Nucleic acid binder design. Structure first.
Ligand SMILES: O=C(O)CCC(=O)C(=O)O
Ligand SMILES: [Mn+2]
Length: 203
DNA sequence: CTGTATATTGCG
DNA sequence: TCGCAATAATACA
């Protein structure tokens, strides 16, 4: 069964792919195998200022591709067994295909990601995004674009969702046209979390 | 009276 | 501790 997350312009689906034992093993292999970007490849530019990202990132996928957000371009690394196994399984469950994965690792509840839409030029038009989570459960927040700021034109409610160990969140079109998402700071969370967002990228 | 868009600071 | 409006400076269209 899928929990359907629906609101005006919001269309997402949530389910648990893996039980505890399997999700533990996958997490441990991710921790062991994934090579994260450092230094110059972990700095972004937002509002005219450069910052080191408050988390760790890695990109895997087919050769040739490119992934640019916030002034930072990330070349994908060749697929490794554990990412292919997760990719293929998501594909078998959803029917959707993927040639790329972005990995965000939050070492604890102080690591986080800011509010944004996934609306890249390099993202295939109307292609779903598969977000698979491992480790600590973290709250994932959807805010509507017209409901943000000083004076909002719309009073659409915020949508909050705990992403569990071994879960899958599907973000279908047009979720990313109208809704920003983020993983806010959760100061009580002491354990790491690894998130995989599988995507379809144009060459 | 009025373009649009975007990590931490500075509040509450 | 949590939420979030303001905004570091441009870069557009
Ligand atoms: O950490 C997550 O659950 C999602 C991360 C994300 O949205 C991104 O990396 O663009
Ligand atoms: Mn995202």
């Amino acid at each position: 069964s899928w929990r359907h997350i629906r609101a005006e312009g919001l269309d997402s689906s949530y389910t648990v792919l893996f039980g505890k034992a399997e999700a533990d093993e996958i997490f441990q292999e991710l921790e062991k195998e994934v090579e994260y970007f450092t230094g110059a490849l972990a700095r972004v530019q937002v509002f005219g200022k450069w910052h080191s990202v408050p988390r760790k990132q890695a990109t895997y996928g087919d050769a040739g591709l490119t992934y640019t957000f916030s002034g930072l371009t990330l070349s994908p690394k060749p697929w490794i067994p554990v990412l292919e196994r997760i990719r293929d399984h998501v594909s078998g469950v959803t029917g959707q295909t993927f040639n790329f994965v972005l990995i965000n690792r939050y070492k604890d509840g102080s690591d986080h990601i800011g509010e944004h839409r996934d609306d890249c030029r390099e993202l295939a038009p109307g292609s779903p995004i598969a977000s698979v989570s491992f480790g600590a459960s973290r709250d994932f927040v959807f805010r509507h674009k017209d409901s943000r700021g000083k004076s909002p034109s719309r009073r659409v409610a915020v949508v909050r969702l705990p992403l569990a160990h071994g879960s899958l969140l599907m973000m279908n079109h047009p979720t990313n046209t109208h809704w920003y998402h983020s993983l806010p700071v959760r100061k009580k969370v002491l354990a790491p979390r690894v998130n995989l967002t599988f995507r379809k990228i144009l060459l």
